[PDB]
A paper describes a structure:
Here we describe the two-component-like orphan response regulator RitR (Repressor of iron transport Regulator) as the archetype of a novel family of peroxide-sensing transcription factors in the pneumococcus and related species. RitR contains an Aspartate-less Receiver (ALR) REC-like domain, which retains the common (α/β) fold of canonical REC versions, yet lacks “invariant” residues in its catalytic pocket required for typical phosphotransfer, including the phospho-accepting Asp residue crucial for the histidine kinase-response regulator phosphorelay.. Here we show that RitR regulates pneumococcal iron homeostasis in response to cellular peroxide concentrations through its single Cys (Cys128) located within the linker domain of the protein. Atomic structures of RitR in its oxidized and reduced states demonstrate a dramatic mechanism of activation that hinges on the helical unraveling and subsequent formation of an inter-protomer disulfide bridge to enable DNA binding and transcriptional regulation of Piu.
Author numbering: 2 to 125, 134 to 190, 192 to 230
The structure:
């Protein structure tokens, strides 16, 4: 059912991951170059794109930016060595739904992919202040400009906007990282990223930190 685009620079690992993911009944398209991966992701809606930090002909960050122009909520996961991921950690957190270290254990990869899919599917209010949300296409517009929220950022905004009450970090973790089974610090990171996308200098932020409680949407 679900469709995976896979670009892995280690050939034997690429072949192993392709075969093992197909045993889970995923359709897997293996590609060797970033330019080809981008052309395919532009024409097909993949449920997961699994890449290294560097695709060879371009960085994953560059791939993700180019894809985001038309598919901003694309679901990208990064598999790489610890050193390579940590060298690009802030960048990766800002475009990738998740990351996983080499050497990979296949049972762990399979479990994490399943959780990511189920957290998106469960998720899958149309205005707030100057924002308009297109829930069918997972797109957000602040005025006549598209705001290129990532999948995680979109899911976080939808959770905040869908709740009349203030939400704790633990509630936001359970909604936006559903099925992934504990550290709420990640919520604070993605709140920071989301504010960076939505907020206008000299306006009140779109997100209020509520003392002793959590986060909620904020009026102008």
């Amino acid at each position: 059912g679900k469709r995976i685009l896979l670009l892995e620079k280690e050939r034997n690992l690429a072949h192993f991951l392709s075969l093992e993911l197909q045993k889970e009944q995923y359709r897997v398209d293996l590609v060797e170059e970033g330019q080809k991966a981008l052309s395919m992701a532009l024409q097909t809606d993949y449920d997961l794109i699994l890449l290294n930090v560097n695709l060879g002909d371009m960085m994953a960050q560059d791939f993700a930016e180019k894809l985001s122009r038309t598919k901003p909520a694309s679901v990208i996961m990064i598999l790489d060595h610890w050193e390579d991921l940590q060298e690009e950690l802030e960048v990766v957190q800002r475009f990738a739904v998740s990351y996983i270290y080499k050497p990979v254990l296949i049972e762990n990869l399979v479990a994490r992919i399943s959780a990511i899919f189920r957290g998106r599917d469960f998720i899958d209010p149309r205005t707030y202040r100057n924002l308009r949300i297109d829930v069918e296409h997972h797109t957000v517009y602040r005025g006549e400009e598209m705001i290129a929220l990532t999948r995680r950022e979109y899911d976080l905004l939808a959770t905040l906007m869908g709740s009349k009450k203030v939400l704790t970090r633990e509630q936001l973790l359970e909604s936006v990282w559903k099925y992934e089974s504990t550290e709420t610090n990640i919520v604070d990171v993605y709140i920071r990223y989301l504010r960076s996308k939505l907020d206008v200098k000299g306006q009140k932020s779109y997100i209020k930190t509520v003392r002793g409680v959590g986060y909620t949407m904020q009026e102008g």
